Ligand binder design. Sequence first.
Ligand SMILES: Cc1cc2nc3c(=O)[nH]c(=O)nc-3n(C[C@H](O)[C@H](O)[C@H](O)COP(=O)(O)OP(=O)(O)OC[C@H]3O[C@@H](n4cnc5c(N)ncnc54)[C@H](O)[C@@H]3O)c2cc1C
Length: 447
Amino acid sequence: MKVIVLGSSHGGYEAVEELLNLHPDAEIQWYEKGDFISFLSAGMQLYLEGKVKDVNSVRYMTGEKMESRGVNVFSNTEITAIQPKEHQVTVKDLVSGEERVENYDKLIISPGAVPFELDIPGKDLDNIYLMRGRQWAIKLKQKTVDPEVNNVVVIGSGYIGIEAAEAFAKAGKKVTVIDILDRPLGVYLDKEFTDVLTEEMEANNITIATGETVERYEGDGRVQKVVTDKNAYDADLVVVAVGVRPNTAWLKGTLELHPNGLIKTDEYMRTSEPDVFAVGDATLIKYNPADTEVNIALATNARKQGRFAVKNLEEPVKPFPGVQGSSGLAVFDYKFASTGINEVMAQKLGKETKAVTVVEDYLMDFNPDKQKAWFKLVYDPETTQILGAQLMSKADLTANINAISLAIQAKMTIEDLAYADFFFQPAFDKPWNIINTAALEAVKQER
Ligand SMILES: Cc1cc2nc3c(=O)[nH]c(=O)nc-3n(C[C@H](O)[C@H](O)[C@H](O)COP(=O)(O)OP(=O)(O)OC[C@H]3O[C@@H](n4cnc5c(N)ncnc54)[C@H](O)[C@@H]3O)c2cc1C
């Protein structure tokens, strides 16, 4: 059986891993149009902050290692088109210019996504940077030590924008974050959490300019000003982290796509055409909190989809279990994690919810290491089933969100979590831990 896998990132990589243990016998070709196999864009912040010194070690696989396992790796080779009926792809070797047609028995594609750019006046004056991949990582790192860069503006206040804002504020630069949305990180956290984080960022000289539409970049040759409908900001560097666009335009007319460019797939990762599977940021995934399909562009999602595509290679036998959208990050001293439905998700999906937020020390009063922790539990008003949770503290309590992700998947209720058995030892927690305490509050609220 000959299987071709497109993409060396999270989705494509895991499909190769599951093929190696489920179909050791197969001829496997792995294609990457880029020069570098499996660079980890998630590790970019650690590199930019100087935690990791070698940009080339921020990866999880090399072509050499895969070839030792019998995989045919083709870097600098792009799959230009798919001919689904006759089961062929045309590939182009980007270093020699040679094209060729390759046949396959099964095709798994994980084409990914590309940074969204603002198509506005000034669009590409110099020093308007993006944040994805090895080349952008290197360029961003050189700007971190440049004495000419004094003011940097990042557009977008989501996960990637706040990572870039923290990295340049730690490098000693003045940062302004601009967005149309009213709160940074609203897709991940609710207002009681983002109010605390806004203060922490402002204490580290990051200005957050919310509710402003960027209209043009101004500058002579290189960017010098970012002007919005409401203001003008000096900028020596702009990082655009507004969002991501599916890399699927080349597939229009070949595979069925959603209006927004996402590939249509079912619960077995099958596309509209026989024997081609699609995985990763370019697809929608089953979202268990609301029993619907949502696009959640995370490495965890792409890796699970990748393995499920190989499981369903010959027969639709293993439907995808679904996910909860779990994410976590540190912003200066605060470490937060969240899963399931929050206010922005509930609004987008038209979902009614109830919630309780508990803010108190996570260790007993006599223990001098005690610190404040914020925990919000979101539940369904009719069934009281768990729908989401968010937590934050300067102490790392993030592994507790893993228990809430399972609770949502299992359809547990506030009563189940109020009395769930979690260990107690006073150097680690209180007799009723952070999850028990918030659920106990919800039980009182619903009496
Ligand atoms: C700065 C940053 C930080 C992130 N941090 C986290 C995090 O901490 N936790 C988390 O879970 N997720 C994180 N993510 C998200 C995560 O990186 C993505 O969800 C994941 O990489 C998606 O994998 P993918 O295979 O779908 O696509 P992509 O990563 O977009 O990879 C697509 C690959 O296929 C190649 N390709 C595309 N078309 C072709 C073609 N036609 N022929 C051959 N090759 C082709 C591309 O060159 C690319 O290498 C982060 C993303 C960024 C940018």
